[PDB]
């Protein structure tokens, strides 16, 4: 069954998302374009979805590893060195779709030449989910704030709850999404590095805090 | 007195020709223990390891260090006690590298 | 042989060529402030070792990750050439070198 709770790494303080929240970057509603990373690449960022996940371990691991990278950067003396991150718990309603089923249906209807094995591998390894064109401010409840100092080597975690959140009996959409075959050529699935992270996840999760180093998966996924 | 270091992550890798021996080579770099202050040797441990060039291929340590360095995951290291020559200076040398399972293997 | 060291350079251009009977391959490094740096190595050392294949593996890994790999270059005994590249240091996959 669909998981009532989905999870999302972010860096926006709860002071504003609790009133406004997340929104789709554009209007391009192709599943293959979101799960391959092109529709979420700089200059072509118009995906009609909001990326979430049904796992807390992955979000915690990514936050901790960005903590480590921020401390390591502070070793190089290029900033302040205090790390802040947020994890959002989002109740699921009927606008949320699963990436694995969507991608498998998309491949099935368009033959085996329109697929990309690493795209589905990334979706399953990240438990990607896609909220349609918006995440309502009616469905973000729990926020985890993580702060860290590197030179002193200290960590701190705090939890907060949204009051405005409205509580119905809802769950994610059981059925997959279907859209038309995209017409744009795709050269490769775009992923982030250290750790291996989906491009659109790492880019929407970023806020106005430089450019992400996005690398095609197939090039380095094999031995050199 | 072989030393033990917890939740080590490899932060930088490098390749060098071996100063003493011409037929050998030196794969090594900089590692850190996860979440500690950056003012201690365990936060910037110089790891170094010696690779043999007579037979082409890659050692198990090669594959391990490459994969963990790209995926950047916590592994504990049982290393020592024969220090190595990081730029003619004393650094650490690896014997055992084991990936952390959870909170019981990896403090 | 006035060897120099450079850090935080990002690899932009890679080449592999057949000058003479020696396999050769070349790197260009570039930052936003310093002039482009040329550094590259041939196969003068006998190929009985795996020095060249491993060096190429590390070079292509550095480019394909588009990291900030730091390096040392030895100047050439004639004005204007990549002399010889000896040490390769891949900085943190999202950071800078020591």
């Amino acid at each position, epitope marked *: 069954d669909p998981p009532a709770t989905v999870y999302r790494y972010d860096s926006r303080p709860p002071e504003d998302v609790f009133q406004n929240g997340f929104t789709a970057w554009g209007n391009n509603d192709n599943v293959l374009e979101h799960l391959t990373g092109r529709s979420c690449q700089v200059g072509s960022s118009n995906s009609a979805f909001v990326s979430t996940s049904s796992s807390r371990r992955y979000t915690e691991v990514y936050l901790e590893h960005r903590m480590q990278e921020a401390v390591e950067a502070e*070793r190089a*003396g290029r900033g302040t060195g205090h790390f802040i991150g947020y994890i959002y718990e989002v109740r699921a309603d009927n606008n949320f779709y699963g990436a694995a089923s969507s991608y498998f249906e998309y491949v099935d209807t368009y033959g085996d030449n329109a697929g990309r094995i690493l795209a589905g591998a990334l979706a399953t390894y990240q438990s990607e989910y896609l909220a349609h064109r918006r995440i309502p401010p009616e469905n973000i409840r729990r926020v985890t704030r993580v702060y860290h100092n590197g030179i002193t080597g200290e960590t701190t975690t705090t939890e907060y709850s949204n009051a405005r959140y409205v509580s119905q009996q809802t769950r994610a959409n059981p059925n997959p999404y279907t859209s038309r075959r995209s017409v744009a050529s795709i050269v490769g699935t775009l992923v982030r590095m250290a750790p291996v992270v989906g491009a659109c996840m790492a880019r929407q999760a970023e806020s106005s805090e430089e450019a992400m180093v996005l690398v095609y998966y197939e090039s380095i996924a094999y031995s050199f | 007195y072989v030393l033990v270091k917890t939740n080590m992550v490899v932060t930088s890798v490098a390749m060098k020709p071996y*100063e*003493v021996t011409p037929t050998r080579m030196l794969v090594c770099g900089i590692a850190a223990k996860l979440g500690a202050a*950056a*003012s201690s040797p365990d936060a*910037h441990v110089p790891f170094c390891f010696g690779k043999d060039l007579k037979r082409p291929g890659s050692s198990p340590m090669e594959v391990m260090l490459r994969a963990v360095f790209m995926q950047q995951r916590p592994l504990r290291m049982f290393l020592g006690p024969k220090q190595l*020559t990081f730029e*003619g*200076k004393p650094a650490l040398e690896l014997i055992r590298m084991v990936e952390c399972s959870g909170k019981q293997d990896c403090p | 042989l006035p060897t120099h*060291l450079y850090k935080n350079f990002t690899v932009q251009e890679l080449a592999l060529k057949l000058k003479g009977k020696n396999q050769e391959f070349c790197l260009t490094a570039f930052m936003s402030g310093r002039s482009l740096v040329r550094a590259c190595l041939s196969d003068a050392g006998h190929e009985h070792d795996t020095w060249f294949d491993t060096m190429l593996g590390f070079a292509i890994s550095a480019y394909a990750l588009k990291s900030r790999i730091a390096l040392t270059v030895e100047d050439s005994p004639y004005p204007g050439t990549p002399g010889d590249l000896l040490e390769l240091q891949i900085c943190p996959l999202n950071g800078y070198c*020591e």
Partner: antibody, heavy 130, light 112 residues
């Protein structure tokens, strides 16, 4: 090699945070090997107190970690010997060394420092007087 | 601890030769490679030890071939054929096997 520079009076006033440091301007760390401070003018003996290299990390000392304030900038070449509330029992012109670095000599086969009088403050002496 | 006589009584000499002589280092190794893996270190006043070489196969590396430092078996020698007005004198303990910074025994002869 690197021209060690230091500025200040030649006296280390007691009950105060005395500090000496080799703030080189031009002899930047690059052709410089390890530079470890010392206080060995009186009772000439081989010892180490601070720590510095080509990295940029601070540390403390084994003789008295708390007495010596942690100030070792291995990136700015400030291998400072900084003793907060220094003890007057040891009386010498302590030096913040910048090694007269010996390069990788072929005959040596390893690190070989030909640094007899490595470095110190030219006129930044240390004496127990106020 | 490393208790090695790093400074012998020696004998006086005029300019161009050593004022000091061979001093019995306890940590003197008769290495298998026939080279006494030791550096010529001078811990006398005015300058700390200067380990000009390593692995001690010959005269100090990258320096004049006149001076030398090598310690084998039961005796070390930081005195060599020729030396300048003030470059030579009391020896110390410096080797390519290990590097324990230990104070020298202390012995100097009058300089002309």
């Amino acid at each position: 090699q690197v021209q060690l520079q230091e500025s200040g009076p030649g006296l280390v006033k007691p009950s105060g945070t005395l500090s000496l440091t080799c703030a080189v301007s031009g002899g930047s760390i690059s052709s410089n090997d390890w530079w470890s401070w010392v206080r060995q003018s009186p009772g000439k003996g081989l010892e180490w107190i601070g720590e510095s290299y080509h990295s940029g990390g601070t540390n403390y000392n084994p003789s008295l970690t708390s007495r010596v304030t942690i100030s070792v900038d291995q990136s700015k070449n400030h291998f400072s010997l900084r003793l907060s509330s220094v003890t007057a029992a040891d009386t010498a012109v302590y030096f913040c060394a910048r090694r007269t670095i010996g390069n990788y000599d072929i005959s040596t086969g390893y690190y070989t420092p030909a640094v007899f009088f490595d470095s110190w403050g030219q006129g930044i002496l240390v004496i127990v007087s106020s | 601890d490393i208790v090695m006589t790093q400074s012998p009584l020696s004998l006086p000499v005029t300019p161009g030769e050593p004022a000091s002589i061979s001093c019995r280092s306890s940590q003197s190794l008769l290495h298998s490679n026939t080279y006494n893996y030791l550096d010529w270190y001078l811990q006398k006043p005015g300058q700390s030890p200067q380990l000009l070489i390593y692995l001690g196969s010959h005269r100090a590396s990258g320096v004049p071939d006149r001076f030398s430092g090598s310690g084998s078996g039961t005796d070390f020698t930081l005195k060599i054929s020729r030396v300048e007005a003030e470059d030579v004198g009391v020896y110390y303990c410096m080797q390519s096997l290990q590097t324990p910074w230990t104070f020298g025994q202390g012995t100097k002869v009058e300089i002309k």
